[PDB]
Design a protein around this ligand. Structure first.
Ligand SMILES: *[C@@H]1O[C@H](CO)[C@@H](O[C@@H]2O[C@H](CO)[C@@H](O[C@@H]3O[C@H](CO[C@H]4O[C@H](CO[C@H]5O[C@H](CO)[C@@H](O)[C@H](O)[C@@H]5O[C@H]5O[C@H](CO)[C@@H](O)[C@H](O)[C@@H]5O)[C@@H](O)[C@H](O[C@H]5O[C@H](CO)[C@@H](O)[C@H](O)[C@@H]5O)[C@@H]4O)[C@@H](O)[C@H](O[C@H]4O[C@H](CO)[C@@H](O)[C@H](O)[C@@H]4O[C@H]4O[C@H](CO)[C@@H](O)[C@H](O)[C@@H]4O)[C@@H]3O)[C@H](O)[C@H]2NC(C)=O)[C@H](O)[C@H]1NC(C)=O
Ligand SMILES: *[C@@H]1O[C@H](CO)[C@@H](O[C@@H]2O[C@H](CO)[C@@H](O[C@@H]3O[C@H](CO[C@H]4O[C@H](CO)[C@@H](O)[C@H](O)[C@@H]4O)[C@@H](O)[C@H](O[C@H]4O[C@H](CO)[C@@H](O)[C@H](O)[C@@H]4O[C@H]4O[C@H](CO)[C@@H](O)[C@H](O)[C@@H]4O)[C@@H]3O)[C@H](O)[C@H]2NC(C)=O)[C@H](O)[C@H]1NC(C)=O
Ligand SMILES: *[C@@H]1O[C@H](CO)[C@@H](O[C@@H]2O[C@H](CO)[C@@H](O[C@@H]3O[C@H](CO[C@H]4O[C@H](CO)[C@@H](O)[C@H](O)[C@@H]4O)[C@@H](O)[C@H](O[C@H]4O[C@H](CO)[C@@H](O)[C@H](O)[C@@H]4O[C@H]4O[C@H](CO)[C@@H](O)[C@H](O)[C@@H]4O)[C@@H]3O)[C@H](O)[C@H]2NC(C)=O)[C@H](O)[C@H]1NC(C)=O
Ligand SMILES: *[C@@H]1O[C@H](CO)[C@@H](O[C@@H]2O[C@H](CO)[C@@H](O[C@@H]3O[C@H](CO[C@H]4O[C@H](CO)[C@@H](O)[C@H](O)[C@@H]4O)[C@@H](O)[C@H](O[C@H]4O[C@H](CO)[C@@H](O)[C@H](O)[C@@H]4O)[C@@H]3O)[C@H](O)[C@H]2NC(C)=O)[C@H](O)[C@H]1NC(C)=O
Ligand SMILES: *[C@@H]1O[C@H](CO)[C@@H](O[C@@H]2O[C@H](CO)[C@@H](O[C@@H]3O[C@H](CO[C@H]4O[C@H](CO)[C@@H](O)[C@H](O)[C@@H]4O)[C@@H](O)[C@H](O[C@H]4O[C@H](CO)[C@@H](O)[C@H](O)[C@@H]4O)[C@@H]3O)[C@H](O)[C@H]2NC(C)=O)[C@H](O)[C@H]1NC(C)=O
Ligand SMILES: *[C@@H]1O[C@H](CO)[C@@H](O[C@@H]2O[C@H](CO)[C@@H](O)[C@H](O)[C@H]2NC(C)=O)[C@H](O)[C@H]1NC(C)=O
Ligand SMILES: *[C@@H]1O[C@H](CO)[C@@H](O[C@@H]2O[C@H](CO)[C@@H](O)[C@H](O)[C@H]2NC(C)=O)[C@H](O)[C@H]1NC(C)=O
Ligand SMILES: *[C@@H]1O[C@H](CO)[C@@H](O[C@@H]2O[C@H](CO)[C@@H](O)[C@H](O)[C@H]2NC(C)=O)[C@H](O)[C@H]1NC(C)=O
Ligand SMILES: *[C@@H]1O[C@H](CO)[C@@H](O[C@@H]2O[C@H](CO)[C@@H](O)[C@H](O)[C@H]2NC(C)=O)[C@H](O)[C@H]1NC(C)=O
Ligand SMILES: *[C@@H]1O[C@H](CO)[C@@H](O[C@@H]2O[C@H](CO)[C@@H](O)[C@H](O)[C@H]2NC(C)=O)[C@H](O)[C@H]1NC(C)=O
Ligand SMILES: *[C@@H]1O[C@H](CO)[C@@H](O)[C@H](O)[C@H]1NC(C)=O
Ligand SMILES: *[C@@H]1O[C@H](CO)[C@@H](O)[C@H](O)[C@H]1NC(C)=O
Ligand SMILES: *[C@@H]1O[C@H](CO)[C@@H](O)[C@H](O)[C@H]1NC(C)=O
Ligand SMILES: *[C@@H]1O[C@H](CO)[C@@H](O)[C@H](O)[C@H]1NC(C)=O
Ligand SMILES: *[C@@H]1O[C@H](CO)[C@@H](O)[C@H](O)[C@H]1NC(C)=O
Ligand SMILES: *[C@@H]1O[C@H](CO)[C@@H](O)[C@H](O)[C@H]1NC(C)=O
Ligand SMILES: *[C@@H]1O[C@H](CO)[C@@H](O)[C@H](O)[C@H]1NC(C)=O
Ligand SMILES: *[C@@H]1O[C@H](CO)[C@@H](O)[C@H](O)[C@H]1NC(C)=O
Ligand SMILES: *[C@@H]1O[C@H](CO)[C@@H](O)[C@H](O)[C@H]1NC(C)=O
Lengths: 108, 132, 452, 130, 132, 132, 130, 53
């Protein structure tokens, strides 16, 4: 009943990096998933809303999608300032809670 | 997804939803009805305007017998000419805005029928109580 | 068989026309022209619901809200100006001459005019002197008279009232609603697929301007261009900017405000003298914020006019009310020579990197003061703006532009305030009053029971 | 614009009762779509959800800490108060109070789903020591 | 002579006919009820006047229990002092205008009786539902 | 001491008496409801004010199902949190003014419950009529 | 003042469908007492009544020509349209559209009786030939 | 000179109108009432135990 995603998804720059976070029917299948970016020492910020939309302020590079019980966050044009801890969270209704992910590391 | 009881929805909510779903949110709309200087005249005109609009609906409801009932059935039958679509596709495939636009031409005929029918429901009832 | 049933309170609305009333937060004897103290308090947090699965058409060119509140403003101005002094006795011969004091060389904008003014008692008359701008006095066959003496009785503003642009909310009565669009790329006319219902609008500041929309709300996504018929060159164009540019305007001078008695119970205030040097009013605009701003709007116009060179030029000329950028600052009416702002053109093909233009560079402007104003583009009224002691400075942000288009190749766009009503159209473009129809009739299988 | 500010003691003894208060402005907790969450993050690891409270006066807590958590709101003071009891040494973490944006749709009854938590707080640090 | 259904008649129609005949044309009268410048003030004064007159009748009807009923029977008996004419000669030999003129003096007494009777109909009914 | 029928009492009478005793004088209060120059504007502002206040109460009554009933029972149960005192001490030991003061805080919750309950009473009733 | 003007083709072939339209002004066809008749008169002999339409949307036709006649009204265009089919050589006659004035009285139900047809038309001539 | 010449134009009472103190009654609309106290030793502020409507 917890989303599982690959931690330490470090890779080179100047390319397209795709990450995925798995879930279940209760959490990913029947609800929406949102992504967040958090450099250590401060609060996170939103990147993905409604699984396919992004607020005003996020670069054109960040994008994601939802398919069945799994989701993705496609990021292109990686830069030296695009490293932080990334999370995915979604309401589940199994415990009636907005359970978060496990957190990843993106190091160039 | 957590459920909303439909009493917490805002004004004009569920307008774009199906007619059957919107039938469960009649209460919220009813609450909002009847909510010397230059401003005073315009404000005073606004207050009378709100009263007139609210009273117009209630006057029609009283004649039709639905004086206080939010949902009321009647004895007049529905005519296929006014609408030909089936019940399943009416309550679960379109919104209230489209439905009113479709039958806006036959509104006058239906209003007269309700007054005629309900008035007949009163005189015959009176005849029944006179047999004691 | 099916039977008819009546539903009360259905979500159905129909376009309609109705009156509106103001609403503003409490502010605090203080006097305001808009009488916001008499306006109804709005709310801490008004109720707003975002509707879904709904598409509604909008048309701001046939919106009665702009027409309605347009007549409200003129009545409000009239309501406050009735108990104010009338300057009919001032229509007397003026013995004007050059002002003397020890740029300063160009002093031919204010003249020291002397006249016989009636004292508290009617029979006696005494000599008085005051300073008047050259735009408000005309010569004769070597004497001068006020420009208004042959047009109409010309009144005054009581200084007790202040006419700063306090934001106000136009709210409809019960049984009516106002529909608000939320699409970030919505032009003047077309369907809106993110309509939201609100009891009434946000704070709207009534600002009087000709060529530039000041201290207003900004577009969210990108620059918005609105016009009823773009192909028609006779209709004005409203441009809404997503990035704002600050404007600083001032009248540097400490002008003593002198009270002059002109009759029994009548007293008016004029300019006393100058303490220092003669210096013209001016407005300063950054070079990069304007060159970049005209760059962004230039490419936006390219889509509507493909493969066409776009150039911005100064106004044609004629009357000074619309040729110049007229605005207000602490109650002083300015008229800025806007010719250097529109001194560039957009090339659809080329390189436009901003680093080429030097920074810390501003665009100084020449502006003039006119304390006799005829307003609403109709010669039937006055408001004589009294002076203010000391120097004034007003800072604001530019929000929108009012441009007009005038055979092949280059396309010329010029600034012009053709109609005043377009000032508020840029704020009410995303609003529409509507009436509620809570009656609904549909077939059903339920039948009314009759007691026997 | 919405601003979220939280406050609470840093040095917290075990076994006692602590109070966390998050102050909000620019909106009301009674209108449609309003709601505030509570997030924990021990240092150097992922986040954790404590509870959340909506404008419908409906309170939702984590299953593992249902008995230890009770939340409340204040309409007059315009604040949300979180009470926790029987802390542990592993309670050392940063507390975040955040506001949520959501959507509504009908499926055998009206439902509310959160598209994401938009407005976060600066954070308050709590320590369990002596 | 072709027949009129009595729904097509105009306002104040059947005024000169018998009371029984005019009892079939109550609907048409109900429909017509609630149908800065110098004119605006007079027009505004007219709108409030119409609302006040319509609401006065409805207020009396609600207390008497005929909130929405066009024809309603009551429990109070008729007194011979108020009227001595037989039923046959009342519904088939004179108009409504004459009837109201005849009993205009006793209208105050009858009005109070309806409020007292209907109010008594409520308290005793409440006592019956308390036995569950 | 001769007896008064409670219909002859004046307006706001029996205010200082017990709640049970005052329940028999509801009629008298209902009667008094809706009883160019400077005076005309103030008088005109007074007439609209009276209409607005009266219509506010009637709007709530209609939704609750007590459109015309002066005393109406409902299906929602009473909560001990709102009031803890027994029935004997409520109807025979204090006045109406004190009672409203005590429960003025819970008025909002009760109003919503009546709308929700009565609205539910309509949809389920409609389902019963569809079985014919 | 009321004016009745009619129009239609003069040369009419047999077996086809013809349309007669009478234009009226100065009154409405929805108000009480309104009604328009259709009269025929072959040359040199008496009149004949085709049909009539009242403000109650009630249409009355002659028994001998019930199937051959169908009448209609137009509220927007403010006209009455008469349609006749399967003409005969004896159909050569002058067509008149006229307005009626009447009375109402109660006898076991409200009744409407006509006192006489007051306003007539100028007339239109129809011929059956080739 | 007149005292008011340097202050404000001063109007005149038309002799046709008379401004004698005719008693008047201020009355509220329906749905409102006016409460009248009857204690003979009642000062400006305090409870009144003989209130009459
Ligand atoms: C369809 O259209 C929908 C509407 O456009 C759209 O929904 C909207 O989506 C956006 C994007 O998610 C939301 O934007 C956020 O808004 C937050 C503030 O929200 C509050 O204020 C709103 C505005 O309030 C004014 O205007 C109202 C107009 O109706 C008035 O009613 C108000 O009274 C108020 O007026 C006052 O102020 C005016 C000027 O502001 C002034 O003129 C006026 O006179 C008066 O003084 C309210 O609408 C809103 O109310 C809603 O929500 C509350 C609960 O929150 C309910 O109670 C209400 O009933 C109603 O439902 C709020 O009260 C912003 O703070 C927020 O900013 C953050 O996010 C953006 C990007 O998303 C960042 O750029 C920004 O910097 C902020 O993030 C930063 O800070 C955080 C820390 O806080 C940090 O962590 C982060 O990293 C970053 O640094 C954001 O912009 C908007 O709220 C949604 N609703 C509305 C109504 O607009 C929908 O998505 C569209 N699409 C669909 C449906 O598919
Ligand atoms: C804006 O518009 C969008 C799309 O236009 C809309 O989303 C869609 O809403 C509709 C209605 O809310 C959804 O349709 C419902 O879906 C549920 C669940 O569907 C899943 O499960 C079924 C199997 O159960 C699968 O086949 C399906 O593929 C999905 O996986 C259904 O359960 C619903 O069925 C009920 O409603 C039907 C139509 O009214 C009835 O015919 C049917 O019998 C069901 O009614 C019965 O339900 C109970 C069953 O026990 C019973 O107790 C009841 O009394 C009743 O008899 C229905 O098909 C659709 O899935 C949505 N699509 C999406 C989200 O992509 C938004 O809702 C709309 N916005 C708003 C605000 O309304
Ligand atoms: C303006 O004033 C004039 C005159 O004052 C008035 O005209 C008169 O109207 C009355 C009422 O409409 C007419 O009286 C009715 O006449 C019919 C027919 O009368 C002829 O036939 C009878 C035999 O049937 C002859 O004796 C008579 O001489 C005529 O030749 C009667 O049938 C009516 O009887 C009914 O009404 C009576 C009174 O209400 C009842 O006592 C009687 O029982 C009948 O009622 C029953 O009728 C049905 C019978 O089956 C039954 O189904 C019902 O349920 C009901 O029980 C009645 O006497 C009178 O003739 C008119 N006189 C004229 C025209 O010269 C105008 O009408 C008035 N204007 C308006 C607008 O009203
Ligand atoms: C577009 O929008 C901008 C943004 O508001 C406007 O810029 C403001 O305009 C207002 C109105 O002209 C300015 O308000 C004025 O401020 C003066 C200075 O205030 C400062 O200094 C005093 C001490 O000298 C301090 O007490 C004060 O707190 C400030 O720190 C005031 O002296 C003015 O006073 C006026 O109002 C009072 C009210 O009682 C009267 O008694 C006075 O006699 C006088 O009439 C006045 O309040 C404001 O300074 C401008 N800047 C800002 C940042 O707000 C643009 O003017 C506007 N443009 C258009 C065209 O509408
Ligand atoms: C952003 O900022 C840049 C620069 O800061 C602005 O670009 C300048 O634009 C002006 C106006 O176009 C340029 O001035 C001159 O424009 C002439 C337009 O041609 C017409 O007018 C001339 C007038 O004599 C006629 O002869 C001609 O037939 C046309 O009818 C050009 O012809 C001029 O070119 C001459 O001077 C340049 C100087 O660099 C020489 O290189 C040329 O060879 C030629 O001799 C001249 O360009 C000005 O030069 C531009 N400066 C630049 C590009 O650095 C942008 O306009 C501004 N953004 C916006 C939106 O306005
Ligand atoms: C404007 O003109 C008036 C005269 O009409 C000037 O007033 C005189 O000024 C001189 C020098 O300042 C004094 O010596 C006189 O006593 C003044 N006489 C009066 C009647 O005022 C005034 O100074 C001029 N002002 C300017 C700015 O030129
Ligand atoms: C539009 O403007 C562009 C430049 O902004 C013009 O391009 C120049 O055109 C002249 C001929 O008129 C050529 O000699 C130059 O070589 C062109 N410039 C460059 C950089 O090549 C263009 O002519 C203008 N007119 C049109 C119709 O595009
Ligand atoms: C690059 O410059 C060219 C100028 O030739 C622009 O395209 C041409 O515009 C002229 C305008 O008179 C047309 O006659 C030509 O047909 C256009 N060329 C083509 C191939 O269609 C072009 O728009 C400029 N590039 C950009 C990005 O604006
Ligand atoms: C882009 O901006 C740079 C910023 O300066 C421009 O570079 C300048 O160009 C001028 C003229 O060639 C030189 O005199 C300066 O020395 C240059 N400065 C620097 C720092 O390089 C450049 O010209 C711009 N690009 C254009 C106009 O295409
Ligand atoms: C814009 O032009 C001015 C011209 O004065 C530049 O001012 C120079 O600034 C530098 C750094 O502050 C000084 O060392 C020079 O002495 C200044 N020039 C003078 C006084 O003539 C200014 O730097 C230019 N803008 C930019 C961004 O460089
Ligand atoms: C007007 O001013 C000039 C200034 O030199 C002066 O000579 C002249 O006498 C003045 N006019 C009168 C009537 O005094
Ligand atoms: C608003 O409408 C435009 C097209 O008219 C569309 O591109 C835009 O995405 C819409 N806004 C939304 C969906 O938020
Ligand atoms: C505005 O937008 C609509 C739809 O996007 C489009 O049809 C129309 O041409 C645009 N321009 C005007 C002036 O309406
Ligand atoms: C404003 O819109 C222009 C359109 O080209 C865009 O380039 C610019 O980045 C936008 N700026 C902001 C602050 O949205
Ligand atoms: C704009 O006006 C021109 C003038 O001829 C016309 O041809 C064109 O159709 C108009 N376009 C509109 C109204 O969208
Ligand atoms: C203008 O004159 C006044 C009065 O002498 C003085 O107080 C003020 O400082 C002067 N203005 C400036 C900018 O010094
Ligand atoms: C504005 O100034 C320019 C030069 O700066 C001048 O050519 C033009 O005539 C002026 N226009 C007005 C109306 O003052
Ligand atoms: C808009 O104007 C206000 C007050 O004049 C100012 O505080 C604000 O910074 C301005 N906006 C920008 C983007 O500079
Ligand atoms: C009114 O109150 C005073 C004390 O406040 C009391 O002495 C007096 O007797 C009262 N009047 C009566 C009881 O009539």
């Amino acid at each position: 009943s917890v989303l599982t995603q690959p931690p330490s998804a470090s890779e080179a720059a100047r390319k397209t990096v795709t990450i995925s976070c798995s879930g279940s029917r209760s959490n990913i299948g029947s609800n929406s998933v949102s992504w967040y970016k958090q450099v250590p020492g401060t609060a996170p910020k939103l990147l993905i809303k409604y699984n396919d939309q992004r607020p005003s302020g996020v670069s054109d590079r960040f994008s994601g999608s939802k398919s069945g019980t799994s989701a993705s966050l496609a990021i292109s044009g990686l830069q030296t300032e695009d490293e932080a801890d990334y999370y995915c969270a979604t309401w589940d209704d199994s415990l009636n809670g907005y359970i978060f992910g496990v957190g990843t590391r993106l190091i160039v | 997804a957590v459920g909303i009881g439909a009493v917490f929805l805002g004004f004009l909510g569920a307008a774009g939803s199906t007619m059957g779903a919107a039938s469960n949110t009649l209460t919220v709309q009813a609450r909002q009805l009847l909510s010397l200087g230059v401003w005073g005249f315009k404000q005073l005109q606004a207050r009378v305007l709100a009263i007139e609009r609210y009273l117009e609906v209630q006057q029609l409801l009283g004649i039709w017998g639905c004086s206080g009932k939010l949902i009321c059935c009647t004895n007049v039958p529905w005519n296929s000419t006014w609408s030909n679509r089936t019940q399943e596709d009416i309550w679960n495939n379109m919104t209230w805005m489209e439905w009113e636009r479709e039958i806006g031409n036959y509104t006058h005929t239906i209003y007269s029928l309700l007054e005629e029918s309900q008035f007949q429901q009163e005189i015959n009832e009176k005849d029944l109580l006179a047999l004691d | 068989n099916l039977w008819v049933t009546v539903y009360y309170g259905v979500p159905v609305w129909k376009e309609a026309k109705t009156t509106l009333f103001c609403a503003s937060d409490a502010k605090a004897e203080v006097h305001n022209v808009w009488a916001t103290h008499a306006c109804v308090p709005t709310d801490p947090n008004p109720q707003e619901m975002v509707l879904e699965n709904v598409t509604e058409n909008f048309n701001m060119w046939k919106n009665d809200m702009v027409d309605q509140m347009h007549e409200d403003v003129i009545s409000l101005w009239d309501q406050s100006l009735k108990p104010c002094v009338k300057l009919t006795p001032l229509c007397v011969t003026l013995n004007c001459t050059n002002t003397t004091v020890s740029s300063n060389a160009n002093f031919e904008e204010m003249k020291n005019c002397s006249f016989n003014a009636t004292t508290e008692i009617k029979d006696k008359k005494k000599n008085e002197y005051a300073l008047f701008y050259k735009l408000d006095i005309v010569p004769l066959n070597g004497k001068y008279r006020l420009i208004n003496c042959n047009t109409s009785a010309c009144t005054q503003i009581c200084p007790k009232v202040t006419f700063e642009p306090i934001p106000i909310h136009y709210c409809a009565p019960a049984g009516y609603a106002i529909l608000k669009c939320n699409n970030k790329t919505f032009n003047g006319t077309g369907p809106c697929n993110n309509v939201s219902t609100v009891q009434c609008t946000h704070g709207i500041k009534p600002v009087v301007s000709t060529q530039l929309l000041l201290n207003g709300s900004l577009a969210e996504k990108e620059i918005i261009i609105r016009s009823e018929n773009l192909t028609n060159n006779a209709k004005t164009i409203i441009v809404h900017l997503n990035e704002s540019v600050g404007i600083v305007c001032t009248r540097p001078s400490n002008m003593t405000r002198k009270s002059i008695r002109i009759g029994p119970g009548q007293t008016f205030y004029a300019l006393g003298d100058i303490i220092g040097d003669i210096r013209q009013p001016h407005c300063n605009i950054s070079k990069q914020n304007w060159n970049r701003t005209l760059q962004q709007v230039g490419r936006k116009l390219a889509e509507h006019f493909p493969n066409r060179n776009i150039t911005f030029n100064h106004s044609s000329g004629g009357d000074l009310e619309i040729t110049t950028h007229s605005f207000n600052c602490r109650g002083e009416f300015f008229y800025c020579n806007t010719s250097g702002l529109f001194n560039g053109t957009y090339h659809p093909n080329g390189t436009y990197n901003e680093t080429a233009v030097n920074s810390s560079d501003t665009i100084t402007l020449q502006c003039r003061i006119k304390q006799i104003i005829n307003m609403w583009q109709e010669v039937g009224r006055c408001m004589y703006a009294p002076p203010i002691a000391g120097n004034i400075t007003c800072n604001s942000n530019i929000t929108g532009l009012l441009l007009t288009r005038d055979q092949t190749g280059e396309e010329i766009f010029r600034p012009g305030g053709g109609d005043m009503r377009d000032n508020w159209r840029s704020e009410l473009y995303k609003y529409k009053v509507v009436e509620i129809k809570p009656l609904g009739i549909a077939p059903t299988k339920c039948k009314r029971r009759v007691v026997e | 614009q919405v601003t979220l500010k939280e406050s609470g003691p840093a040095l917290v003894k075990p076994t006692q009762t602590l109070t966390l208060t998050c102050t909000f402005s620019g909106f009301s907790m009674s209108n449609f779509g309003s709601g505030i969450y509570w997030i924990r993050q021990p240092p150097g690891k992922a986040l954790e959800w404590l509870a959340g409270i909506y404008w419908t006066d409906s309170k939702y807590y984590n299953l593992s800490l249902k008995t230890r958590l009770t939340i409340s709101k204040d309409t007059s003071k315009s604040q949300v108060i979180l009470i926790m009891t029987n802390m542990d040494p592993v309670d050392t973490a940063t507390y975040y109070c955040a506001d949520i944006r959501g959507r509504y749709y009908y499926s055998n009854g009206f439902l509310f789903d959160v598209v994401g938590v938009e407005s976060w707080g600066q954070g308050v640090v709590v320590t369990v020591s002596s």
